[PDB]
Swiss-Prot record:
Spans through the membrane: none
Modified residue annotations for Phosphoserine: 51, 94, 158-159
Organism: Saccharomyces cerevisiae (strain ATCC 204508 / S288c) (Baker's yeast)
One GO CC term on file: cytosolic large ribosomal subunit
Signal peptide (from-to): none
Gene3D superfamilies, per database record: 2.30.30.30, Nucleic acid-binding proteins, Ribosomal protein L2, domain 3
SMART domains on file: Ribosomal_L2, Ribosomal_L2_C
Gene Ontology BP terms: cytoplasmic translation; maintenance of translational fidelity; ribosomal large subunit biogenesis
Family: Belongs to the universal ribosomal protein uL2 family.
Annotated protein name in UniProt: Large ribosomal subunit protein uL2A
Chief location category: cytoplasm
Annotated function: Component of the ribosome, a large ribonucleoprotein complex responsible for the synthesis of proteins in the cell. The small ribosomal subunit (SSU) binds messenger RNAs (mRNAs) and translates the encoded message by selecting cognate aminoacyl-transfer RNA (tRNA) molecules. The large subunit (LSU) contains the ribosomal catalytic site termed the peptidyl transferase center (PTC), which catalyzes the formation of peptide bonds, thereby polymerizing the amino acids delivered by tRNAs into a polypeptide chain.
Length: 246
RNA sequence: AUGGUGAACUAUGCCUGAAUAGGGUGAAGCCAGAGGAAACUCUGGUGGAGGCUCGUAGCGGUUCUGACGUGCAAAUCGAUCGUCGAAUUUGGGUAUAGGGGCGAAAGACUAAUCGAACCAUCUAGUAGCUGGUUCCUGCCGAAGUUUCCCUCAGGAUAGCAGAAGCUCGUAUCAGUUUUAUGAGGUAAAGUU
RNA sequence: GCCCUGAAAAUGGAUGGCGCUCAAGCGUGUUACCUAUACUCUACCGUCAGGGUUGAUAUGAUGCCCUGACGAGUAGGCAGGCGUGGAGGUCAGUGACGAAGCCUAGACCGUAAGGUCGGGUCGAACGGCCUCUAGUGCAGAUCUUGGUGGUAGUAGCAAAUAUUCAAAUGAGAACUUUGAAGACUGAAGUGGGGAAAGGUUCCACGUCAACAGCAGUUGGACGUGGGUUAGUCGAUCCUAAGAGAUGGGGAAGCUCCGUUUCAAAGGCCUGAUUUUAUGCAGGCCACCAUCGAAAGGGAAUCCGGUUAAGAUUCCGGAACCUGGAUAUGGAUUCUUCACGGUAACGUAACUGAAUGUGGAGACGUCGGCGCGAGCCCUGGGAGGAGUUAUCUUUUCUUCUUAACAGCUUAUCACCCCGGAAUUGGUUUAUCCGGAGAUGGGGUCUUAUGGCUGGAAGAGGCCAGCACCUUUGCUGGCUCCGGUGCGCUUGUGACGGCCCGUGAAAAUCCACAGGAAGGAAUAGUUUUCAUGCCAGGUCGUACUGAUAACCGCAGCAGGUCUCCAAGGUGAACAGCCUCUAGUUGAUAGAAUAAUGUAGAUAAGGGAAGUCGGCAAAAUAGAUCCGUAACUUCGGGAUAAGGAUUGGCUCUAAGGGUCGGGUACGAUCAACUUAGAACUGGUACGGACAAGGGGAAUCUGACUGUCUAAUUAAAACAUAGCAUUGCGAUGGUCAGAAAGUGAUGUUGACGCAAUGUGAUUUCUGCCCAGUGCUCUGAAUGUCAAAGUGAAGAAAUUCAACCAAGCGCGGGUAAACGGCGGGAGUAACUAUGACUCUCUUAAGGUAGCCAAAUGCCUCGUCAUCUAAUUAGUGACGCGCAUGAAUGGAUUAACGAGAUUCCCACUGUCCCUAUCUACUAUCUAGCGAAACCACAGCCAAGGGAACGGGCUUGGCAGAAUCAGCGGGGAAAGAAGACCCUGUUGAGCUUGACUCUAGUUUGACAUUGUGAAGAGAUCUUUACUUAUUCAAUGAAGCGGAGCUGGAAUUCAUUUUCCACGUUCUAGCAUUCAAGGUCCCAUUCGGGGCUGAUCCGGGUUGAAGACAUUGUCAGGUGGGGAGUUUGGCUGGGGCGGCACAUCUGUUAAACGAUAACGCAGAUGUCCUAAGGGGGGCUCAUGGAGAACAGAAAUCUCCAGUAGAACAAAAGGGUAAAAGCCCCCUUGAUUUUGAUUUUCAGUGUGAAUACAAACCAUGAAAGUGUGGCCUAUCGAUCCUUUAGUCCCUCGGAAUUUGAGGCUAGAGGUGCCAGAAAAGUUACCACAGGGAUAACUGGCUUGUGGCAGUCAAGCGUUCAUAGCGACAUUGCUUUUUGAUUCUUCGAUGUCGGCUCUUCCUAUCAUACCGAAGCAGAAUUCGGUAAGCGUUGGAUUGUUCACCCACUAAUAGGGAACGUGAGCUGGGUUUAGACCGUCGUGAGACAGGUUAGUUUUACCCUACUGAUGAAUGUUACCGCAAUAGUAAUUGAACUUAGUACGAGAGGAACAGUUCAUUCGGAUAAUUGGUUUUUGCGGCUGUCUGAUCA
């Protein structure tokens, strides 16, 4: 047979990311003395649009502790920040939108975003627009914290893991019908070559497992085992249930 | 099967450039007037939006089932037609290479090659199948049948045939009758 | 007996032909005669057999002779010879006095292959014989290479409008050169330049062999030369998307990863030196190769002139940049590092290191608005040219101003003053103001414009003088203005759009900071001026295409880009012109057919056709007017109507401008509306330029795709929904990896799918298959470990993960949605109860729908007529719900139906225009070809050009033509075979990458808790992950203080920064103390101390390696029987048995017929004994049609395991009694047969046994069937053989005899599929024509049982029998698969008769009229349509009639392409799937004639020359049918009704002409009219 279309994204030739207009990797600040023993203040210089992403970025400019200069970094902008805002970062900072605190330093029921999985990864969870995690509880001994991931999963992380207060800007984005194949063309030119999607039904027995036949139909179950093997996997993969919800 | 060569055509993404008369329709936004309690609705303007529309260059390639069909042309020529501001058109740079690539999907495209490219070797690949097989004359001269075979377009085996002769030569034979003596159960007859 | 009738088939026509009649016919008899390769006799050749002959003194003993007989021959075999290239010998061979070779209707020998000689050409080598050896003999192979024919002086050299006269050159001119004309490209060019590419094509001179598909004096050719000049233009430099070293890391390795990565990765700024230069000095800065753009970024150049060919490069002049050196003037300095203005900021200058920050480089698109530049238009003036018959203050042309430099200028931005309601300012576009608007006054940038310098001395245009030359010289003028919705490009300020916000870097500058360095008897500054020196390397020519590039080429194709004049007009459309450029494409004469491209048609108006295909009609603008429907956006140019030229006028729309603190004037526009007049009613006058409407199927839309047969209803899309995934991850890659894509990512994300906008809904089903599980059990489970037995190998027994097993969920997962029953007031409908299927029974909806076989469904409507269309109906072969179901406005080069308008599609053709064809000069192929080219019939491979019999036939040809040459194109794509393949699918057979588990190793330290090992959990240092220019870890401290003190602190928290877009750097200021004060340096602290674990997470688990189970079409390799009246299904004729087919020994076939076999039996085997069966008759309680008992008769009518046939009576049967011969060793024989195997049997022998008194009998079944190799496993036997250095015990291997199985039965281990297909072949074999048969089909006789008022034959025929038919359907499989082009229609010719009409006849139960049946008869006719691809059919209307057929089911180098029948796509059923179809639907490349004949037309040599007038052999032959008036309301007739011969006037179909008239046509461009444009207008 042939090598199918999803097996063909691994070698990553024309499928790589379209990286040109991107302002940079949006991260939080390296974890250092000043931030874990106290706070350090920047100001947000301009909040700007990043290509390929859905949410704006902010550029806050800190002062390097050990050398005379400025250093400016790329934060995914929480909703409500504004240029000219002081952004405080560190253990002793205060609870306000945009300030990055450790999670142990905030009461339960606090709404933070761009939170870290492990301390010093410079952010992981809830970076898409409109997302947030809630802090639902603490474990002050063998220090952990109980947070609610934007999907609704409940994860338990370290209490030295930082996160920035508030909701990520760009909420409401998918409320608007996209309305034409052109606007979906301008969406994925800045992301990657995924589009448009030929139904595996509509291709030949070589192109796909769903291909062939004098009618268009799958012919065998569209749910595939998690223990399937490379290229067998197309369709709903290792689903526990299927079909419209009620 | 192995080891090599190709994105100058074409496929799709990226980088950086360039290219596109004139018309029709007249969306938000905005201005004056008219009505009325109101929310608002009605008239005249203003503006100039859209994968809107007619149509040139451009890109295509619907119909004639036209011309041509040892052509101008291994895909062209004429009339007609689709679209013509965006999922557009295109130059160069660039990335993806053969059981791979790329595909808005036709098994399409990948240098006139694509249901597995191109080039050399393994390779004088294998063929129970088609075609061919080169001078004379003399003596002899068949077979399409038995048995067995994944045997039925083929082989082994026996038969028919040629050649080499060998021991011998009055002689045992014979696609024949006669006498003698068995077996038969078809034709007629109606058990013989 | 003969003859006739019965007796009819298609090109013309065959006793073989002519022809034959007291035969040349038929039946028979006697004779004569003809002639085969056979017969007889003879000669000769060879073959075979039988014999004769060895004596010197010859030449053969493979020899000579004698005698006889015999002679076909493919595949095949053998014997004997001929020929070729080399080797050994010999002829002391031949030969320049001519070897070899070649040509030779010259000669000789040989049966032949071949040999010998003569003559001619020719020039250096070569033969005969006894032998050796081999790349040794050609007619084919769609054979290889090479050469050449016929075709043929033929096909053609026809797009892009087009040429002509003269002169010059020359040997030669349609083509070269100049002039003169005529045209064209028309500035989106046929111009003026470049990019890629070429490479010298550029230019000059010479030359014309070849090339330029004609010519050539010309050339992009040929020979010889010459030509490309740079500090500024490019490259070079920078980076983009990417490529790629180093360090490291994999890899047997070629090499791979990665690009700042686990790295000790480097050279600077000057202070310290005045032994000398650079030691030592503090500080720094961590970006850490390189490559990557002639279109992006970027230091700087312009004008004029110049060459045969180069120029932003050379010349002359005028500038500028960069790198470097220093000198002069100015400026500054005593207030050491300038002043002014309130401010915006100003200026000739006017210090500045490390370090840091900011700007530039630096960016999308569209829309209008403003301002510029060039172009366009245009008035006054100064010149030159063209027109002037007349008019024209006229028409055309020259009046130009570079880089650079200095000075002034403007939107936007900004400052000051003042402080706004009575809110004002304000843009085309409504934004602005107490966060300070309008107003008054200023700053600023300088794209841009303005004046001055460049710079008039240049350039241009005029005139005037000299003159082989060289040529100059000489004057003049080179000026002042207007306008815009104009066009092109630049720019600025605004606006729109995005789930799209639209590069990087080198490079340069500014600012912050304050390192340092320097005024006073004098010290700086190269960012002010001026001056000085150097500016390298490679590119530079020319085309950029209807001949310089690529397409084999001098190819109508392909190929990125700039500039862009006037008119018409909306216009960069079309048409026409100015500047520049060509005039190249073979030509000349004629005007046949058929063509190709372009026009027109009387009347009708799709009647043509699969179908309105194709053409026509419409068209621009202005005013009037617009429907259903709709998602309210549209539909809409809906549909439809009215005007439009010319001239002369009227009206409305703008500007600049002066008013002491209402009006006047002038300038300049293309816009609209109105009114009179005007004419052959013409006016978007040419050009350019929608046809429209009522519905249906289908996809929402824009968009995309099979380049070169499909543009679609297919793919895509938005929208909808589902699924995995929280990074120690989801999906994927890699051979590996210190490895990679999504990811510069984080659920509003990434990945995997299915549906397809909107509206409206998405029913029931979890049994199957699949996926999943917070679920549970004690089933199965490998490796390791474990326990036992053994001397050990080893055997076994338990235990075990994951996986399956179990149970749960799951349908917008794959998918399914039946059967059997009941039950509502005539029949009947059937809401419901009941239950059988390992699940549920098709819900809403929709339908003969693209899904409905039957089927041309039934009903209505459309139409004169409808297999079409639409509306309804629905037990729907086989509709139906994200397999998505219904409905839908707008859209569509999609499929279909109807209507209006229009038409040559048609009736029904005709005419016309250019280019061909045709003829001529030059040039000049190819396809194809066995040999060829006249027919009829026959036979024959079943359709001959040749053969046999006839007809016939006269040189040589020209243009047409499409009948034939089963014409050419291609070792049939269809079907089938081969032990040939490939693509794809699966639960096929055999494995595999990956993944999920267990064990051992990495792997150390030790605690808890359950189980007779496991679950927790600690340790850190291995191992793993993560971050950072490895900065603030761990421990103790001091200060407060939450704290609340039960002795005193028991303990944790703390411990410099939160109104604000300011600022944070130099060992740190301060504080203190040192050193030898000397300017400054070294300490401590400021800033607590100790350990140098860089900081977090994880941790003996992950990971890693090696084994092990499981999972694994994601992938690989392979297979997917045989015979067969094609193949498939079935069957077993595949191993067997009986009867028959079988024709009296045996043998004998078919998918012939009737059946059977894969078992059954310790007796049904073996021996022995006694007895008699089936059945009938006659008797006996219950007792019956039969129980049981008894006697007779009883040849087998019973039984004998089973199929059938044989066999059997004191038995072979029935019943008893005893027994295991159904045993052991092995050889011979028969049967099927090779006299092999297996199976079954026969007869003995050697033992040992059963039975019987005994003879005897028995080696399974009374007889004919009931069965199996090698290899492997196993058992018995002897207790034998071997384990090979010698022994013992296990183990293993042998010999002999059994079993376990191959049914495809002489014995592989094996699923589909192809409509994407492939190869080698097959007419050994299908579909398709033909051939034969005729079952049928369809047609014609014979007897007449019988219908008909009686009446068998007016008119029939049943029962049946006898025939014919090749337009039925079949059967066979003879020709064709190295191809006979397949349906139907259109077109056109011809033949048959089986007569539909017409002619003439016979008949009736015929009065007439009418009709009917037959007779001769094929002369002549036979139609227009609706529905359908339709043949067929059936309807409508006409007709005298609307008969049946043949000709390769006539006819595709004649058409068409509707149908079947590829590849694309949709549906229904079916299959797990790829895929399949008694199917429906849509889209789909139709090649060649010039050859030979034939046909149709056209010439023609020889008939002594030549002319005119004829004859007529043979051939062809044509007219047709109807109606009206009359006869006549007569005849016949009660009447109703109602004819005919003759005569006459017109008509239908056909045919031949012809053109007076009518019509069509029009290049008479004959005359007139009209448009745009050009010639200056009138005119032409």
């Amino acid at each position: 047979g042939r090598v199918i279309r999803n097996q063909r994204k691994g070698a990553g030739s024309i499928f790589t990311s379209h990286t040109r207009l991107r302002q940079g990797a949006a991260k939080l600040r390296t974890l250092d003395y000043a931030e874990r023993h106290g706070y350090i203040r920047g100001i947000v210089k301009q909040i700007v649009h990043d290509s390929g992403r859905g949410a704006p970025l902010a550029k806050v400019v800190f002062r390097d502790p050990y050398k005379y200069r400025l250093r400016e970094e790329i934060f995914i902008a929480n909703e409500g920040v504004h240029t000219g805002q002081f952004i405080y970062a560190g253990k002793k900072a205060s609870l306000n939108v945009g300030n990055v605190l450790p999670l142990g330093s905030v009461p339960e029921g606090t709404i933070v975003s761009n939170v870290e999985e492990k301390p010093g990864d410079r952010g992981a969870l809830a970076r898409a627009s409109g997302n947030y995690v809630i802090i639902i509880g603490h474990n002050p001994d063998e220090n952990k914290t109980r947070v609610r991931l934007p999907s609704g999963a409940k994860k338990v992380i370290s209490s030295d893991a930082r996160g920035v207060i508030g909701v990520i800007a760009g909420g409401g984005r998918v409320d608007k019908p996209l309305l034409k194949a052109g606007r979906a063309f301008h969406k994925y030119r800045l992301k990657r070559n995924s589009w448009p999607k030929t139904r595996g039904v509509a291709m030949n027995p070589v192109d796909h497992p769903h291909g062939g036949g004098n009618h268009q139909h799958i012919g065998k179950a569209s749910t595939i085992s998690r223990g399937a093997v490379s290229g067998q996997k197309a369709g709903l993969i290792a689903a526990r249930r299927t079909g419209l919800l009620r």
